[PDB]
Design a protein around this ligand. Structure first.
Ligand code: CLA
Ligand code: CLA
Ligand code: CLA
Ligand code: CLA
Ligand code: CLA
Ligand code: CLA
Ligand code: CLA
Ligand code: CLA
Ligand SMILES: CC1=C(/C=C/C(C)=C/C=C/C(C)=C/C=C/C=C(C)/C=C/C=C(C)/C=C/C2=C(C)CCCC2(C)C)C(C)(C)CCC1
Ligand SMILES: CC1=C(/C=C/C(C)=C\C=C\C(C)=C\C=C\C=C(C)/C=C/C=C(C)/C=C/C2=C(C)CCCC2(C)C)C(C)(C)CCC1
Ligand code: SF4
Ligand code: SF4
Ligand code: SF4
Lengths: 74, 146, 74, 81, 733, 142, 158
């Protein structure tokens, strides 16, 4: 739970990109303070959503990270 | 057994001996009604201020009636525990020895009929305390914050 | 273990290209043998290199200590 | 009588149970059915707690002392409160 | 007894709290009670059956009444394809305004949820039309329930207590059941099909008032007396038919077509009428075999005696089975549970193939719910079967009364059976997992062609024989030379072929490799669960680890930690360890069915066939995507109709997890913790005045296992049920 | 049986601060136990329910909740310092009962005079199946 | 053409899969020097998967409606280069291993404590027992003929 919290807080309030003018658009859009307060949120906003890149990972460089995602479960 | 300053001290034993649940020199019904009015004045606060109708001008009566209902439920529970554990002619199970060793008369509070008087007193006292907290919170209500 | 790490940095990394400009060049320090179709593992990491991307974070250290040459790793 | 102990004539009178009985249940008595001329006995099954350590020792064919379970009580349950 | 419970004196002397616990589990049980005899046991069984029937009848009466008081049946008739059903009105004092908003659906005046149990199609197919009908039915059912309870009381007083002989009279009972309970019942159901149902579907309102004059046929009751029975199949309804009225409807009341009604996309009424009229006479004749009081018929004992293969390859054979069955209830219960589980599985497997009720194959949600329901129930009953079989071995099997008979002949080589079951399990498991992992890897690299993909050729040929043509095998019933096809072309084959060759329907789905792999996984689950249960049954008397287990009763904690450790060795523990695999296999089956149908309804079975052969395909296309409508049930931007399910969904993924707390952490830990808590509460002021009555003690070991399994099952059912309903309610397709 | 009890007297207790391993409501309502032994010299020993304390010279007197703890401490005292001991049971009426030796000689070895409570003179395999004895009070091991 | 499955020597979706694969590979190829060893290995894998597609288009592989091979294990030896011959080959290998292990164990049974040779193999005896695999069909055969393969009522102990 500690590491999940860390990942979400960083990707929702610190990490991200900065525009040419200086506007910040964080990697996840800054929905922590409004979607970390519901377990259903944790499913929807963080656990389900940010699990995309591992699950479409077949047929790419990252495909190894995909395979483990099953054996790990197994 | 261990005897730390907490479990053994003049002031702590004094305080615990002065509250109604142990002053055997009073009728059990009166101790019951005293603890009842105590808890009645107690519980009204959060139940009213943070209830599900706090943003409504009825929140006072709402919280107070809810407190009264909880008091009634707990009085039911008290009577039920008493009729469950206390038989109607059998002796008492109260501590009859003090710290020095004075053999104490069996506390009538720890009897079936005594527990019944206690329950009735507690219920009446809780009702009175709740209505008193209401009348002091919504009529004469300047020096408080709510 | 440390020796293996420094070796694989020396003989199998793109460390010099990474030092050239570390802004948008992915640290890679592991290539895989092209035998059983796992060539896809050697994905695009930039800088004219192919290799499994790493996240150990050695490269920031090797740039702090001014290694800046494969002879030193060797 | 809460639990129950049984002993069978495959007892070789080796006396490991008694040495391992935690709450002084078993003992030995003079018999004629082994070299040691002694067989087990359980006249104190009240305090029989129920741990199988006794029959976890009997090094016989299958067993020679069985611990059959039954109802419960205040002392057969290791209660201390 | 001097205190609860009144049925076991040994418990009443337990000042520990587990008393109350075991004062619940061992109530219905009858052997273990104190001072119980045979005939008393039987009379108790009778009273309990009456009570159960009372409960069932009150349940169905409540169903009917609730629909009749808040449902939609009446105005549902007018458009069974554009007005959702209704279950019952909501009255929830915990709602907020948007909740009340998102629940008033389907055309009601308040928050209501959608009835998914398929009761509307049932009560509409027989031909009911008005709320008054439902009121009358509810009153009748309620009175019947009260009557059954009256019987449950009456048969437990003298002047009505049945002696054990009356219970032991198995031949008369069986002849009665196979004759009356089955035959006359089927005939009466055909009666209700041919006196109300069919004319109602043809738009004639007949009820308990006008059925004296209306004939089920213009000149019926006399064509069969004439003997030329074909007059009952002359004019059937046309294939351009309005199920509500008599447009294109004929006058035949008994047909044989084999096709699906076009409008209702279901079976004609006449088909069920004819089938039931047949089965009625079948059962009625069958129920005249066993000698009861007239010297004619058969003695079942004679039958079980006269069977002994020459050369004694079975030994004494079936000699003595009659008594060792008629003397123990548990054997009869094991048989009953087995057969009932099988037929429940059958009902599940057919109710999606040949939609019985009109306008049911459209409310896809209802089909999926019913199928999953019946399948899980069948699984549970099947487990209970082997459970009670092992109980029969533990408690009632006699050695000498069964010397050398087939029963005692089983036990002699239990090792071979267990070994071969384990071999089948190992084979299926190894290869089904190998193929999956191979396909998974070979796609992970981007080479979908290097995968292994077997063709379900056996099942394809079977389908071809049944009449499927897209495989082009041109075998029986697909070729015009075979005697069967050429003898069928005038009886049923037109409509049967019109159905099976059609694709938009649900019968005879096309099948590729993924279906082969899933069927193999299902066979794995079947064989391994069978292994668990049969090991629990045969090894119940005792193995070399504990040869005298048969003296410890059925469920015991263990036989000590020594001599290698003996945790989880009771046969109860075997049933325990089997329930897990039962849930797993049924989950697999329902996964397969639900994905197949949820692809077929959207017309993209291609996606299934492509990406159902690699597990990641299942985790991506089936779970991830199809759950996206659910997990957004309620968000910080509001809620939806799906809210409940989402909520309930999470509920599952919680209760399930709690089960683990009981399957891992065993007692002694919690025992010491309770010790500490007891000392704490004891030495605390203002609370030491309040004493306890039952010394707090952590639960027993088998009690732990039980409650942990209950939690597991509850979570694993709630989760999947809510997901299954929501995924097809958010889309209806 | 010339094996009389000793009628446990009231002799001093070991030096110990008193701790959370003592008696509870149970001991004050149902029953408790007292173990008694004579000691050779003031030494240190770990009590069953926590920590360690010292004994005195002459006879000792320790109270405890359940018999198992008393007998565990007694076996420790017999295997560590080679001293004999007894332990008694008490009831709130005022009764005192003498439990462990029952003759003075350990139950570890033979001492004629003990009866034969609970023997079956047949190997374990000879037990019968519950069906032969169902619907009765009897059980297979009886 | 079993149930209509055309061989992808003639189907089209196979060609589409091949085209898309080589296309994404080639598009990836043009991000390096045309002579860099990684680019060289990329082109090598390109031609390798190409000749794989070719080989598959040479051995009667009936081929799905989605552009994928699909085995035909129905028993017809026409499509036997998938199950029958590899099946009997693996059966030969498995019989080899089973027989050699069984023979080793039966041999080493006759010692003081055979466990010491079951943990630490008699690599000399192992080497002079191992190559006997060529006998596993016939030898065991005679065993069953002479009934020296199974036992009747000896269960425990040995
Ligand atoms: C969530 C906790 C909670 C909340 C919201 C309240 C809320 C309230 N309490 Mg309160 N109270 C609480 C817990 C709480 N109580 C507890 C645990 C105790 C200890 C028994 C008390 C003891 C207490 C006293 C003695 C009094 C209040 C009073 C009050 C009211 C006015 C407070 C003020 O302005 O000063 C208010 C309704 C005052 C009042 O007039 O109540 C109506 C007052 O006299 N409270
Ligand atoms: C046995 C099956 C069954 C079940 C599960 C339910 C379930 C329900 N009934 Mg119900 N009911 C049933 C049979 C059943 N009914 C029958 C047979 C009758 C006719 C006497 C009723 C008459 C009835 C009334 C009059 C009301 C309910 C209501 C309700 C709901 C709240 C619970 C309640 O007050 O129940 C009460 C159940 C009984 C008193 C049982 C009587 C026997 C709940 C959905 C309430 C509602 O409308 O919820 C929205 C309500 O006011 N029921
Ligand atoms: C054709 C006549 C007939 C019919 C329709 C039934 C119908 C039924 N019997 Mg039944 N029964 C009959 C004759 C019949 N009995 C006779 C003649 C005997 C004596 C041999 C029995 C002895 C009997 C027993 C012992 C039991 C039933 C039971 C049942 C019920 C099974 C649950 C459905 C059902 C109501 C079960 C039940 O629920 O009790 C009523 C049950 O346990 N029957
Ligand atoms: C088994 C249940 C059952 C029962 C109780 C009845 C009862 C009845 N039928 Mg009947 N019927 C049944 C099954 C049944 N039928 C079946 C299965 C068929 C189809 C073969 C028919 C076909 C039939 C005809 C054709 C007629 C009746 C008629 C009748 C009525 C007078 C019979 C003289 C009577 C109400 C006659 C009538 O006038 O009905 C009111 C009549 O003409 N029935
Ligand atoms: C026709 C259906 C049917 C009937 C009549 C019985 C009847 C019986 N079963 Mg049984 N059983 C069934 C189906 C049935 N079962 C099925 C389907 C399963 C598989 C899940 C089981 C699994 C099962 C086990 C594992 C055991 C029984 C036992 C028993 C006997 C005692 C039950 C009792 O008092 O516990 C009632 C229990 C409770 C009230 C507490 C459970 C509440 C649950 C967890 C709530 C959910 C009793 C003869 C027990 C037995 O014979 O012991 C000697 C026993 O050990 N059954
Ligand atoms: C998850 C999971 C899996 C995969 C299994 C698998 C198995 N269980 Mg099982 N089980 C599980 C959960 C699981 N269980 C749970 C949660 C329970 C409830 C407690 C049970 C309860 C249970 C019972 C009660 C029984 C089984 C049995 C079995 C076996 C059935 C035979 C079979 O199909 O072999 C499939 C074999 C495998 C999946 C193993 C292959 C694994 C890989 C391929 C091995 C090679 C890996 C690697 C290359 C080698 C190197 C590894 C390492 C050195 C790095 C099998 C080993 C039964 C049994 O013993 O059957 C004989 C049996 O009696 N299980
Ligand atoms: C009963 C199941 C069964 C069995 C034991 C076999 C077994 C065998 N089949 Mg066979 N097969 C099966 C089902 C089966 N197959 C099915 C369902 C089909 C499709 C309808 C075929 C079609 C088939 C063909 C076309 C051929 C075999 C052949 C063979 C033999 C090589 C082998 C003994 C071959 C044979 O007869 O020997 C060369 C052969 O040519 N099979
Ligand atoms: C050569 C030795 C040998 C032989 C002839 C057999 C033969 C058999 N085993 Mg088996 N087994 C073995 C070793 C062997 N086993 C070992 C080492 C293990 C432990 C991993 C098992 C575990 C095992 C189980 C769990 C089961 C069998 C079963 C069976 C039977 C059916 C075949 C099967 O399912 O196997 C499946 C294949 C395996 C389990 C693989 C094991 C084979 C190993 C890897 C070979 C070992 C060779 C040796 C150690 C290496 C030394 C080489 C040499 C130089 C000395 C069959 C009689 C089944 C049965 O009871 O059937 C009725 C069954 O359920 N076996
Ligand atoms: C434990 C035990 C028990 C139990 C057991 C069981 C539970 C069993 C089960 C069993 C089972 C579960 C079985 C099953 C079976 C099945 C079957 C037997 C099937 C058959 C089928 C058929 C025969 C079919 C045919 C056909 C076809 C193929 C198709 C077409 C049509 C026809 C019909 C031709 C008891 C109690 C007794 C006691 C003893 C022990
Ligand atoms: C990340 C991590 C790690 C590690 C890991 C590892 C090292 C491993 C893993 C592993 C895994 C997670 C695995 C999984 C798996 C799964 C599965 C599922 C498997 C399977 C297999 C199979 C299936 C096989 C088969 C076969 C073969 C191939 C051979 C023999 C024959 C057969 C056929 C049987 C670390 C520590 C660094 C850190 C922490 C975390
Ligand atoms: S149960 Fe076994 S071990 Fe525990 S006391 Fe009685 S005999 Fe000794
Ligand atoms: S059982 Fe083992 S230990 Fe107990 S008496 Fe017989 S032999 Fe000695
Ligand atoms: S876990 Fe239950 S069974 Fe296994 S050893 Fe401890 S007690 Fe005996």
């Amino acid at each position: 739970v500690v590491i999940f919290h860390f990942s979400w807080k960083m990707q929702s309030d610190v990490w991200g990109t900065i525009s040419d003018q200086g506007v910040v658009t964080h990697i996840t859009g800054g929905n922590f303070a409004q979607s970390s307060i519901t377990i259903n949120g944790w499913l929807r906003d963080f656990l389900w959503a940010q699990a995309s890149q591992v699950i479409q990972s077949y047929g790419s460089s990252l495909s190894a990270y995909g395979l483990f995602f099953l054996g790990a479960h197994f | 057994s261990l005897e730390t300053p907490v479990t053994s001290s003049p002031l702590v034993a004094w305080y615990l001996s002065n509250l109604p649940a142990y002053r055997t020199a009073v009728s059990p019904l009166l101790r019951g009604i005293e603890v009842g009015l105590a808890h009645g004045y107690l519980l009204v606060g959060p139940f009213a201020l943070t209830g599900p109708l706090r943003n409504t001008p009825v929140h006072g009566q709402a919280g107070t009636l809810g407190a009264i209902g909880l008091v009634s439920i707990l009085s039911v529970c008290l009577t039920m525990y008493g009729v469950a554990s206390f038989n109607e002619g059998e002796p008492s199970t109260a501590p009859v020895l003090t710290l020095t060793g004075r053999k104490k008369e069996a506390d009538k509070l720890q009897t079936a009929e005594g527990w019944s008087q206690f329950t009735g007193g507690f219920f009446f006292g809780g009702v009175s305390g709740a209505v008193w907290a209401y009348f002091l919170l919504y009529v004469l209500d300047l020096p408080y914050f709510f | 273990w440390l020796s293996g790490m420094y070796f694989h940095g020396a003989r199998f990394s793109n460390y010099e290209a990474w030092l050239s400009d570390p802004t948008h060049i992915g640290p890679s320090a592991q290539v895989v043998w092209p035998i059983v179709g796992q060539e896809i593992l050697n994905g695009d990491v930039g800088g004219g290199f192919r290799g499994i991307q790493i996240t150990s974070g050695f490269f920031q250290l090797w740039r702090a200590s001014g290694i800046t040459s494969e002879l030193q790793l060797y | 009588m809460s639990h129950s102990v049984k002993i069978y004539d495959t007892c070789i009178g080796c006396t490991q149970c008694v040495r391992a009985c935690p709450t002084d249940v078993l003992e030995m008595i003079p018999w004629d059915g082994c070299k040691a001329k002694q067989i087990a006995s359980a006249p104190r099954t009240e305090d029989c707690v129920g741990c199988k350590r006794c029959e976890s020792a009997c090094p016989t064919d299958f067993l020679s002392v069985r611990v059959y379970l039954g109802p419960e009580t205040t002392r057969s349950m290791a209660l201390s409160y | 007894e001097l205190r609860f419970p009144r049925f076991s004196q040994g418990l009443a002397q337990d000042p520990t709290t587990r008393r109350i616990w075991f004062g619940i589990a061992t109530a219905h049980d009858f052997e273990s009670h104190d001072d119980i005899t045979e005939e008393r046991l039987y009379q108790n069984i009778f009273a309990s059956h009456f009570g159960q029937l009372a409960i069932i009848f009150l349940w169905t009466s409540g169903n009917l009444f609730h629909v009749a008081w808040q449902g939609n049946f009446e105005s549902w008739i007018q458009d069974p394809l554009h007005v959702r059903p209704i279950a019952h009105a909501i009255w929830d004092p915990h709602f907020g305004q948007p909740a009340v908003e998102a629940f008033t659906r389907g055309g009601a005046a308040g928050p209501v949820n959608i009835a998914y149990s398929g009761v509307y199609q049932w009560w509409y197919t027989i031909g009911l039309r008005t709320n008054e009908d439902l009121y009358t039915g509810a009153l009748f059912l309620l009175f019947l329930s009260t009557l059954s309870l009256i019987a449950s009381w009456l048969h437990l007083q003298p002047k009505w207590k049945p002696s054990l002989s009356w219970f032991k009279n198995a031949e008369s009972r069986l002849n009665h059941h196979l004759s009356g309970l089955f035959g006359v019942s089927s005939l009466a159901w055909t009666g209700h099909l041919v006196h109300v149902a069919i004319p109602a579907s043809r738009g004639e309102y007949v009820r308990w008032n006008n059925f004296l004059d209306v004939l089920p046929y213009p000149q019926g009751l006399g064509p069969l007396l004439t003997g030329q029975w074909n007059l009952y199949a002359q004019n059937p309804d046309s294939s351009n038919h309005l199920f509500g009225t008599a447009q294109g409807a004929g006058t035949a009341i008994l047909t044989l077509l084999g096709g699906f009604h076009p409008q209702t996309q279901s079976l004609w009424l006449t088909d069920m009428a004819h089938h039931h009229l047949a089965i009625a006479f079948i059962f009625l004749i069958a129920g005249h075999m066993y000698r009861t009081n007239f010297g004619i018929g058969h003695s079942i004992k004679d039958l079980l005696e006269a069977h002994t293969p020459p050369g004694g390859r079975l030994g004494r054979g079936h000699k003595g089975l009659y008594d060792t069955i008629n003397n123990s209830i548990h054997f009869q219960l094991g048989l009953a549970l087995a057969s009932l589980g099988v037929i429940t599985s059958l009902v599940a497997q057919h109710m999606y193939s040949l939609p019985p009720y009109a306008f049911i194959a459209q409310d896809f949600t209802t089909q999926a719910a019913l199928y999953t329901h019946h399948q899980y129930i069948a699984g549970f009953i099947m487990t209970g079967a082997f459970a009670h079989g092992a109980i029969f071995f533990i408690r009632d099997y006699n050695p000498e009364q069964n010397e050398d008979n087939v029963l005692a002949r089983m036990l002699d080589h239990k090792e071979a059976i267990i070994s071969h079951l384990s071999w089948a399990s190992l084979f299926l498991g190894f290869h089904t997992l190998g193929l999956y992992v191979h396909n998974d890897v070979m796609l992970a690299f981007g080479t979908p062609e290097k995968q292994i993909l077997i063709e379900p050729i056996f099942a394809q040929w079977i389908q071809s024989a049944h009449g499927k043509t897209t495989y082009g095998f041109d075998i029986l019933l697909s070729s015009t030379n075979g005697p069967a096809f050429n003898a069928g072309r005038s009886l049923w084959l037109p409509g049967w072929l019109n159905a099976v060759n059609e694709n938009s329907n649900s019968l005879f789905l096309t099948i590729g490799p993924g279906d082969f792999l899933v069927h193999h996984a299902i066979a794995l689950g079947l064989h391994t669960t069978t292994l668990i249960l049969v090991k629990g049954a045969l090894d119940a008397r005792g193995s070399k680890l504990m040869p005298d287990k048969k003296d410890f009763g059925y469920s015991f904690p263990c036989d000590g930690p020594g001599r290698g450790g003996t945790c989880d060795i009771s046969a109860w523990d075997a049933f325990y360890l089997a329930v897990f695999w039962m849930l797993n296999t049924i989950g697999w089956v329902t996964f397969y069915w639900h994905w197949k149908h949820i692809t077929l309804w959207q017309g993209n079975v291609s996606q299934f066939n492509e990406s159902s052969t690699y597990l990641m395909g299942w985790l991506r296309d089936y779970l991830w995507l199809n759950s996206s409508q659910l997990i957004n049930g309620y968000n910080p931007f509001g809620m939806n109709s799906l809210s409940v399910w989402a909520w309930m969904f999470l509920f599952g993924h919680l209760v399930w997890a709690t089960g683990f707390m009981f399957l891992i952490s065993w007692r002694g830990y919690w025992q010491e913790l309770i010790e500490t808590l007891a000392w704490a509460h004891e030495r605390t002021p203002l609370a030491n005045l309040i004493r306890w009555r039952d010394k707090p003690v952590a639960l027993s070991i088998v009690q732990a296992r039980l409650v942990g399994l209950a939690h597991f099952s509850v979570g694993y059912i709630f989760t999947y049920a809510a997901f299954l309903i929501a995924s097809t309610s958010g889309k209806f397709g | 049986g010339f094996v009389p009890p000793q009628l446990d007297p009231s002799t001093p207790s070991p030096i110990f601060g008193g701790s959370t391993g003592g008696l509870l409501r149970k001991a004050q309502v149902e029953e408790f136990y007292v173990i008694t032994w004579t000691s050779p010299k003031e030494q240190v020993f770990e009590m069953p329910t926590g920590g360690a304390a010292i004994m005195r010279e002459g006879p000792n007197l320790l109270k405890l909740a359940r018999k198992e703890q008393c007998l565990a401490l007694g076996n420790r005292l017999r295997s560590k310092y080679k001293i004999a001991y007894q332990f008694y049971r008490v009831f709130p009426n005022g009764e005192v009962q003498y439990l462990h030796p029952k003759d003075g000689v350990y139950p570890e070895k033979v001492n004629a005079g003990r009866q034969g409570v609970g023997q079956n003179f047949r190997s374990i395999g000879k037990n019968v199946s519950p069906i032969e004895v169902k619907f009765t009070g009897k059980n297979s091991f009886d | 053409d079993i149930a209509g499955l055309t061989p992808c020597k003639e189907s089209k979706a196979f060609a589409k899969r091949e085209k898309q694969s080589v296309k994404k590979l080639n598009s990836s190829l043009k991000k390096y020097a045309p002579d860099s060893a990684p680019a060289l290995a990329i082109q090598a894998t390109i031609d390798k998967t190409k000749r794989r597609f070719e080989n598959y288009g040479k051995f009667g592989l009936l081929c799905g409606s989605d552009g994928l091979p699909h085995l035909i294990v129905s028993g017809d030896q026409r499509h036997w280069g998938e199950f029958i011959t590899p099946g009997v080959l693996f059966l030969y290998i498995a019989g080899w291993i089973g027989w050699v292990g069984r023979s080793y164990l039966i041999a080493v049974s006759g010692e003081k404590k055979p466990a010491m040779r079951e943990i630490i193999i008699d690599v000399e005896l192992a080497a002079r027992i191992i190559p006997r695999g060529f006998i596993w069909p016939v030898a065991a055969y005679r065993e069953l003929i002479n009934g020296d393969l199974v036992v009747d009522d000896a269960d425990i102990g040995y």
